Nucleic acid binder design. Sequence first.
DNA 1: GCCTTGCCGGGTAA
DNA 2: GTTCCGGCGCG
DNA 3: CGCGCCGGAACTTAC
DNA 4: CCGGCAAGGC
Length: 177
Amino acid sequence: NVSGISAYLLGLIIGDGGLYKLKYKGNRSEYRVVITQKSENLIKQHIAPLMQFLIDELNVKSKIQIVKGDTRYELRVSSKKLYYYFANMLERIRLFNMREQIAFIKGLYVAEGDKTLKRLRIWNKNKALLEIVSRWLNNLGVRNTIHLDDHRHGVYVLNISLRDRIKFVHTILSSHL
DNA sequence: GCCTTGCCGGGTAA
DNA sequence: GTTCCGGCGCG
DNA sequence: CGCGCCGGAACTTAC
DNA sequence: CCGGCAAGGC
Ligand SMILES: [Mg+2]
Ligand SMILES: [Mg+2]
């Protein structure tokens, strides 16, 4: 498990990618698991091998696609099976065990946390998602608050109290999944 | 004096 | 980040 | 006919 | 995501 790696990738996916169920002309379809990032190196050399491992583990026969956009690389797996694997794991997020919580927060922070680490913050439109992470962090002894940060785009922020900086960086960021 | 954290605008990296 | 497109594969 | 993998790329905006 | 500012508190 693999549960760990999966939770981390789901963090990357929810933060910086998506799960897409497409309908085409006609009546064609497609199911996509997507993580996007700017660094060619981070996608190719740390994110992709983790995904590959998960593909082998689950006998997914779809290939890992890396598609180049002008402002970002997109890692893409076209797979009904991989799609529902993450989609179902998402709808079960409230039931994550601790190994899974830690992996997922770390994934989510790689995706859209404050990376200056001068402050410790996670941004998201999804307040309910932050409220879930907030509770996980409290139970791990990392105090935090949530506010509507950006009124222009509806983006909430989860602010991790710098008082628990050491506990956060060592329990979440430097955790070994 | 200094740390912390809400507020809020610019613009890259989704 | 999300959703078109034209292509192909396959029962 | 109906549906699912590939390879984009154009289009939109949430961090 | 970044980061300057200002106000609260030790
Ligand atoms: Mg996001
Ligand atoms: Mg990111």
